[PDB]
Each structure stands twice: as structure tokens, then as C-alpha cells.
Design an enzyme around this catalytic site. Structure first.
Site, PDB file in Angstrom:
ATOM      1  CG  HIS A 142      -1.898   1.115   1.543  1.00  0.00           C
ATOM      2  ND1 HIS A 142      -3.158   1.186   1.354  1.00  0.00           N
ATOM      3  CD2 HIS A 142      -1.502   2.476   1.990  1.00  0.00           C
ATOM      4  CE1 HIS A 142      -3.528   2.494   1.713  1.00  0.00           C
ATOM      5  NE2 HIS A 142      -2.351   3.238   2.242  1.00  0.00           N
ATOM      6  CD  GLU A 143       1.853   3.276   3.732  1.00  0.00           C
ATOM      7  OE1 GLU A 143       1.798   4.327   3.186  1.00  0.00           O
ATOM      8  OE2 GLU A 143       1.029   3.061   4.840  1.00  0.00           O
ATOM      9  CE1 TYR A 157      -3.621   9.914   0.647  1.00  0.00           C
ATOM     10  CE2 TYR A 157      -3.620  11.350   2.482  1.00  0.00           C
ATOM     11  CZ  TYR A 157      -3.757   9.988   1.880  1.00  0.00           C
ATOM     12  OH  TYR A 157      -3.809   8.895   2.931  1.00  0.00           O
ATOM     13  CG  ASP A 226      -9.149  10.200   6.474  1.00  0.00           C
ATOM     14  OD1 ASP A 226      -7.857  10.213   6.557  1.00  0.00           O
ATOM     15  OD2 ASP A 226      -9.982   9.498   6.159  1.00  0.00           O
ATOM     16  CG  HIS A 231      -7.200   6.733   5.153  1.00  0.00           C
ATOM     17  ND1 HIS A 231      -6.840   7.955   5.627  1.00  0.00           N
ATOM     18  CD2 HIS A 231      -6.345   6.064   4.907  1.00  0.00           C
ATOM     19  CE1 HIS A 231      -5.368   7.929   5.449  1.00  0.00           C
ATOM     20  NE2 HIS A 231      -5.055   6.686   5.163  1.00  0.00           N
TER      21      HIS A 231
HETATM   22  C1  LIG Z   1      -2.140   0.689   4.640  1.00  0.00           C
HETATM   23  C2  LIG Z   1      -2.326   0.687   6.120  1.00  0.00           C
HETATM   24  C3  LIG Z   1      -1.546   1.811   6.558  1.00  0.00           C
HETATM   25  C4  LIG Z   1      -1.359   1.939   8.213  1.00  0.00           C
HETATM   26  C5  LIG Z   1      -1.943   3.323   6.139  1.00  0.00           C
HETATM   27  N1  LIG Z   1      -1.168   4.443   6.328  1.00  0.00           N
HETATM   28  C6  LIG Z   1      -3.395   3.660   6.555  1.00  0.00           C
HETATM   29  O1  LIG Z   1      -4.293   3.161   6.099  1.00  0.00           O
HETATM   30  N2  LIG Z   1      -3.481   4.206   7.728  1.00  0.00           N
HETATM   31  C7  LIG Z   1      -4.962   5.003   7.791  1.00  0.00           C
HETATM   32  C8  LIG Z   1      -5.554   4.039   9.005  1.00  0.00           C
HETATM   33  C9  LIG Z   1      -5.082   3.964  10.583  1.00  0.00           C
HETATM   34  C10 LIG Z   1      -3.562   3.657  10.567  1.00  0.00           C
HETATM   35  C11 LIG Z   1      -3.127   3.529  11.956  1.00  0.00           C
HETATM   36  N3  LIG Z   1      -3.777   4.682  12.933  1.00  0.00           N
HETATM   37  C12 LIG Z   1      -4.648   6.383   8.373  1.00  0.00           C
HETATM   38  O2  LIG Z   1      -5.583   6.852   8.823  1.00  0.00           O
HETATM   39  O3  LIG Z   1      -3.669   6.957   8.816  1.00  0.00           O
HETATM   40 ZN   LIG Z   2      -2.475   5.363   2.208  1.00  0.00          ZN
END
Ligand SMILES: CC[C@H](C)[C@H](N)C(=O)N[C@@H](CCCC[NH3+])C(=O)O
Ligand SMILES: [Zn+2]
Ligand SMILES: [Ca+2]
Ligand SMILES: [Ca+2]
Ligand SMILES: [Ca+2]
Ligand SMILES: [Ca+2]
EC number: 3.4.24.27
Length: 316
Positions: A142-143, A157, A226, A231
Site C-alpha cells: 500500500h505504501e 490527497y 481525514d 480513508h
Molecule cells: C495501509 C495501512 C497503513 C497503516 C496506512 N497508512 C493507513 O491506512 N493508515 C490509516 C489507518 C490508520 C492507521 C493507523 N492509525 C490512517 O488513517 O492513517
Molecule cells: Zn495510504
């Protein structure tokens, strides 16, 4: 560093043994010279200065607890490189064999992982919410896929373009997890999230609403949290991608699945040929339609399924 290519051995976050590509010059470094201009893994030493120190080991054996996140960041970056090269004919994230750099042991108790514009960064987790996040192949992929996106479509973003950015990372993170073919699923981060709780994950592509995310455009988030829900609203696209691959009936709309390989081909072509920094969900549907037409023909099942999947999630 200049040195000779070697092969070390160690254990990853989940306790599995694996071979790693290293470089010997006094110490053995986590520097893989076998892929492009190299894969390089660094120790951030519980601090937030990046990248930290290129990972050095005296004996080429990586079995200490402290070693495990490094082993997995390094190894899984290699798998992700192999996926892009072998499946999509893409050489690293920039398509010209750019060095892939990762840092582990970022900060203290840090429950996340990210691409910072230049490299990968992985926390160790607090031990309750997360264990070290490089233990998840889908997380690593993913990253690294953010780096791909940034070099290609360049999706901003925020808001719908940002939710597309996130969904592309979940889609390819999952397709890499299937490519490696250890314990694959359509969930995100299950191997590193909540060690005290079995069967959960951060997000689900097969059923986004299992973790509170929308699975239809009518349920989209339009607030400011967010980055405008990148997300959260990713669930709408994640669901569409899942339907394209696997099929299903969703809110009464039936989709015929065309499988993971075709999903990957359609979305990789959309990402690299049609999406732009400001694409919204409507424009993603158009890009995916055009991509599937290019690959399969306008009257194909593949085109029909793309249209049906977007219809199913309310995206016209
Ligand atoms: C792919 C997962 C990775 C941790 C990614 N940066 C992510 O999805 N982060 C979201 C979910 C929460 C991660 C830990 N609190 C985020 O909202 O940053
Ligand atoms: Zn991401
Ligand atoms: Ca050692
Ligand atoms: Ca899995
Ligand atoms: Ca997964
Ligand atoms: Ca769990």
C-alpha cells in the site's frame, strides 16, 4: 555502500524465517543490489529523524526481536518490486529503477506507516493497536503504491481524488498480497492490527461497512476530517474493485467477476494513462472504462463488468 552482494537470513515480525539480500563491507547492510538501483532499509532508532542509519549487522543473521521489522520491510519491498516488474513491466516506483528506501523503528509506539514523498516509514505500533507495521505485506505494498501514484496519476490527497489515491493503494496492496500467495484476503492490515483480536482489520474491500466505511456514493463522507475522508470514501472504490474481480450483487445490482489479473491490468492502465491529479470518482469510472476498452474491446465482458461495478456503488 560499495560492497559485495550477500544473502542473509532472519525472522520477520510474525516469526517466519526468510532469506534477505544484503551487502558486505565490514558490516552486512540491508542493501539489496538485485533489484533496480537497490532496496535500502534504515534504522530510525525510535526517533523521527529520517532516514536514520543504513541497517548494519555484524554477522548477516537477523533473528533478534529488534531485527524483525527491518527484515520484513526489506523483504516485502522486494516482493512489491517483483510484482510491479513481473506483472506490469514497471521498474520500481518511477519506472526507471529508483532506489527504494524504508525506515523502521520510527518514533515510539507509532501506530502507522507512510510514504513521506521520498521513502517508506514504519512504526513499531504500541503493541495493542498494532505490532510493527512492516509485518503486513499489504501495508508495505500500500505504501509503496503511493510512490507509484505520485509519479504517475499524481492524485491530490484530498476529497475524491484522495479517496481514489487511497483505494489504488488498497487495491494494489491486496494484489501484491495475492501475488506473494501466503495468506491472502481482501482485508487491509489484518496481520499487524490488534494482536489480541482475531479476524479484524483496518478496512475491508469486500464489505467496507464492516468497519464503518461507505460502500455506495450515496453514503459518501463530505466533512473535513481525514483530508475530506480519503480513508473513508476509499471504501466506495474498493467495493467497486472487489466486485469487478470477484463479482456479486450489491444493492440489487449484479456484477460478473473477471478475476484479479484483469482487475490489476485495468486499474494499472487507468492509473498510468488516464487518471490526473484532480480526477474524481466519475472520471475514474471513465478511465477504467477506457482502459478496459483498450485491453479487451468495447463490447467485452470486462467493459460490461466495469460499468456494472461502478453502477453498483452509485458512481456514474
Ligand atoms: C495501509 C495501512 C497503513 C497503516 C496506512 N497508512 C493507513 O491506512 N493508515 C490509516 C489507518 C490508520 C492507521 C493507523 N492509525 C490512517 O488513517 O492513517
Ligand atoms: Zn495510504
Ligand atoms: Ca546479527
Ligand atoms: Ca492476509
Ligand atoms: Ca490483507
Ligand atoms: Ca487483530
Amino acid at each position: 555502500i560499495t560492497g559485495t552482494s550477500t544473502v542473509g537470513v532472519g525472522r520477520g515480525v510474525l516469526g517466519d524465517q526468510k532469506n534477505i539480500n544484503t551487502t558486505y563491507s565490514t558490516y552486512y547492510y540491508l542493501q539489496d543490489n538485485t533489484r533496480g538501483n537497490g532496496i535500502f532499509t534504515y534504522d530510525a532508532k525510535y526517533r523521527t529523524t529520517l532516514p536514520g542509519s543504513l541497517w548494519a549487522d555484524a554477522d548477516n543473521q537477523f533473528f533478534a526481536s529488534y531485527d524483525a521489522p527491518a527484515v520484513d520491510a526489506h523483504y516485502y519491498a522486494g516482493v512489491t518490486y517483483d510484482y510491479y516488474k513481473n506483472v506490469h513491466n514497471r521498474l520500481s516506483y518511477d519506472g526507471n529503477n529508483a532506489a527504494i528506501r524504508s525506515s523502521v523503528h520510527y518514533s515510539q509506539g507509532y501506530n502507522n506507516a507512510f510514504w513521506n514523498g521520498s521513502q517508506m516509514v514504519y512504526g513499531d505500533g504500541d503493541g495493542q493497536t498494532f505490532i510493527p507495521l512492516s509485518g503486513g505485506i499489504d501495508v508495505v505494498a500500500h505504501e509503496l503504491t503511493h510512490a507509484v501514484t505520485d509519479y504517475t496519476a499524481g492524485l491530490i490527497y484530498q476529497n475524491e481524488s484522495g479517496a481514489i489515491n487511497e483505494a489504488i493503494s488498497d487495491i494494489f496492496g491486496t494484489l501484491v498480497e495475492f501475488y506473494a500467495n501466503k495468506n491472502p484476503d481482501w482485508e487491509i492490515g489484518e496481520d499487524v492490527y490488534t494482536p489480541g483480536i482475531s479476524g479484524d482489520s483496518l478496512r475491508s474491500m469486500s464489505d467496507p461497512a464492516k468497519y464503518g466505511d461507505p460502500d455506495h456514493y450515496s453514503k459518501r463522507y463530505t466533512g473535513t476530517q481525514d483530508n475530506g475522508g480519503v480513508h473513508i470514501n476509499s471504501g466506495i472504490i474498493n467495493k467497486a474493485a472487489y466486485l469487478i474481480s470477484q463479482g456479486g450483487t450489491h444493492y440489487g445490482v449484479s456484477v460478473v467477476g473477471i478475476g484479479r489479473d484483469k482487475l490489476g491490468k485495468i486499474f494499472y492502465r487507468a492509473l498510468t494513462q488516464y487518471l490526473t491529479p484532480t480526477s474524481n470518482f466519475s472520471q475514474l469510472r471513465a478511465a477504467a472504462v477506457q482502459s478496459a476498452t483498450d485491453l479487451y474491446g468495447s463490447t467485452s465482458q470486462e467493459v460490461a463488468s466495469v460499468k456494472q461495478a461502478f453502477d453498483a456503488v452509485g458512481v456514474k
